[PDB]
């Protein structure tokens, strides 16, 4: 539906919140992440791609990437949250996103299937035997676009 | 990073490294002397010399291929290779044909080579390969080449892990910084010295070892 | 949870304290408020909110803003933000506080107008230009310091 | 104030569900886990520990590290498998370590969340009295003996 | 057409396949060959796919 | 001094003559150690310096090879396996100590954890089985003055 089980007239993301009211860790009616109102910058998308990396405005405030490269900081893999805009079916006028821990649903590209981290080369990948390892809560379903999370 | 012609979003990425430390390491052998010995038997102080100055490089060869980066070494070449990759394997008839189709799959790619760091069992044996009967297929059809084969070096060196082949270029690939040069030093009072009548012979040197990259460098293990 | 209203006091004041757009989320770092690491005392404790300006130190700890430094992230440009699974606190017995940057009240003089951004100079004006989390435009100053909502 | 302790911290105690996600990713392997660390090892000697700051040193060598009063911005996105340990500190000396990452809960048993210093990797101590710097990006305050995400 | 554009795999392993009367089955030699079939050079690309062979 | 009484291998000699062995008053080999100076040190101490393989003097009396890197010791295999040996004021070396030749312990310096031969003028060496002397198979702890024997 628009808003509740679902979110739709986005193409920045898509349903989200499929569990039924928040349980997010910190949360209190969340804050703006940014893209289709203008972030920073987004790293990757080697095809029609919307997921990037993302970053932490250093706190609870996060937004698409901020920060060069991909190296190590803290903080845990999110399930991703995209609220519906207040617009027709462009992007902007999106709502205060809360950010669930462990919430339903996105898409899941790595190795693994509740597991995914997030890489410069777009979508969510497996690791590396350098850097990083595998270990998410990528959830159900799969569907790989500039609409995704179905 | 495909273009919006594919209508596909251009890909902004960006490189990725992870960052290996050294510290300064020393690299020493000795040889241990009797000087009653050295006098009667004449030469002998001449060959210990060469016996301990052999002995320190050697010591340093095994180092640079086999080990794993601890924290008392360096870079070491077994590491930094890429993996094997069993689809370059093929069946065979010979270790020299092995041996030959490891070597071209680096050209491919666009790797550096110059020279074959084998293990000595590989190497040796690939030397001396059959046609199921005899006939080196890796060497001439009447003479044998042991030196440098396709224009390129090759190295026979004992520990590397077992019956595998590596081509990659020495120059790209590696550099050895040196806070000193190779230097004898002897001292008839030290640990051993005492004890008994003797002169202690130590001939050393202070390294450091940088691996560039994982790449330039391709390892292939033969057929299953 | 306790939101101030006010526009007198630098330490005190809010008007804004989230703050619209779609997609971003992953990544969570949190911080202490006020002055830490004090005394060889082990014990942390919970206190009051203020939500002022804040500026970190550099690492986890954000205190009394007499400056702004830094072009990049979240700078020296930090507000707490107010959460249900907290007691919040500000300055005097912080405790562990979730913390947001961009997009809130910044504090005027008369020198400059418009956007909360990252910038080197304490009373903030333009120059890194477009969103980064900001969707805010002052174009009204006050003397002294005071707290301005965009 | 701020050395290792022992006492259930180092090496690792009993098994809870410390994975969200599936158990066991086989990523980084080639890292080697060191024997002894900083500070005083009571109780066994281990060179990595489940949950806190963790640094690849010397090269194919991965470490503990302090993250002290303050700091953890740039902290970890790989932590060091928590499977096996009772507070979600303590992991196995020696080999090519397994690793997770970030996405899962961990638990930490006894008193205080997310308030004070460390007095160890993976632990909080409060009494709610006396402002004492928090760094990692730990949750909930309101709930003593909570699941905490990294 | 003067030249083979091959995928990196097939060639490799189309390399690597020696007689069992112990002749290199590019050209019959016992020598190091720097990849020639037809006395022709490989050209290789990715894009072409294994088990394909392109002369042009 | 007096001192020594009683079954001590542990603080007689200068290093151990055995930690796990045991002799009495049993004298299956009533010959002398000429290693291990006195004269400069207590009468509960012997002073060795190896207590593993010994060849003969002219007389009577036992003592560590003292052999170079060109020089070796034939047969004559005898270890110290002695704790008091017939005395009455502790063991020191020109009184009684009862040998056996399959005791305990075999210095090893090397790098231990090998078989280990005695050549000991401070060179230390491995064995073999046909190059040097056959130990049986044995691992031998690396520097001396605490060697665990198989």
């Known amino acids: 539906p628009y808003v509740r089980l679902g979110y739709e007239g986005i193409l920045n993301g898509a349903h989200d919140i499929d569990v039924a009211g928040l349980n997010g860790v910190e949360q209190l009616a969340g804050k703006f992440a940014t893209i289709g109102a203008n972030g920073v910058k987004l790293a990757g998308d080697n095809g029609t791609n919307a997921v990037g990396l993302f970053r932490e405005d250093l706190g609870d405030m996060v937004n698409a990437s901020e920060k060069a490269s991909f190296y190590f900081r803290g903080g845990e893999y999110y399930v991703n949250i995209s609220r519906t805009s207040l617009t027709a079916a462009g992007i902007a006028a999106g709502d205060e996103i809360t950010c669930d821990a462990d919430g339903k649903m996105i898409k899941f590209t790595g190795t693994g299937k509740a597991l995914g981290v997030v890489t410069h080369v777009g979508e969510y990948r497996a690791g590396n035997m350098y850097e990083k390892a595998t270990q998410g809560v990528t959830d159900t379903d799969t569907f790989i676009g500039f609409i995704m999370y179905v | ?224």
């Open chain 2, 1 to 224: 990073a495909l273009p919006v012609y594919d209508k596909d979003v251009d890909a902004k990425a960006f490189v990725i490294s992870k960052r290996g430390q050294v510290p300064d390491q020393v690299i020493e052998g000795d040889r241990i002397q009797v000087p009653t010995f050295e006098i009667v038997s004449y030469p002998q102080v001449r060959f210990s010399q060469v016996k301990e100055r052999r002995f320190n490089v050697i010591d340093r060869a095994q180092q640079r291929a086999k080990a794993d980066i601890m924290a008392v070494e360096d870079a070491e070449i077994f590491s930094l290779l890429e993996g094997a990759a069993t689809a370059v394997n093929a069946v065979t008839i010979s270790s020299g044909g092995l041996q030959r189709a490891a070597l071209t799959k680096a050209f491919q790619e666009v790797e550096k080579h110059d020279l074959v760091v084998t293990k000595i069992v590989m190497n040796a044996s690939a030397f001396a390969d059959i046609r199921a009967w005899g006939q080196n297929e890796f060497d001439p059809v009447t003479q044998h080449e042991v030196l440098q084969t396709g224009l390129f070096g090759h190295i026979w060196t004992a520990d590397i892990l077992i019956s595998k082949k590596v081509p990659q270029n020495t120059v790209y690939v590696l550099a050895d910084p040196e806070f000193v040069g190779v230097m004898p030093i002897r001292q008839d009072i030290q640990v051993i010295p005492a004890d008994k009548p003797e002169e202690l012979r130590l001939g050393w040197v202070i390294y450091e070892e940088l691996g560039l990259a994982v790449v330039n460098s391709l390892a292939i293990a033969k057929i299953s």
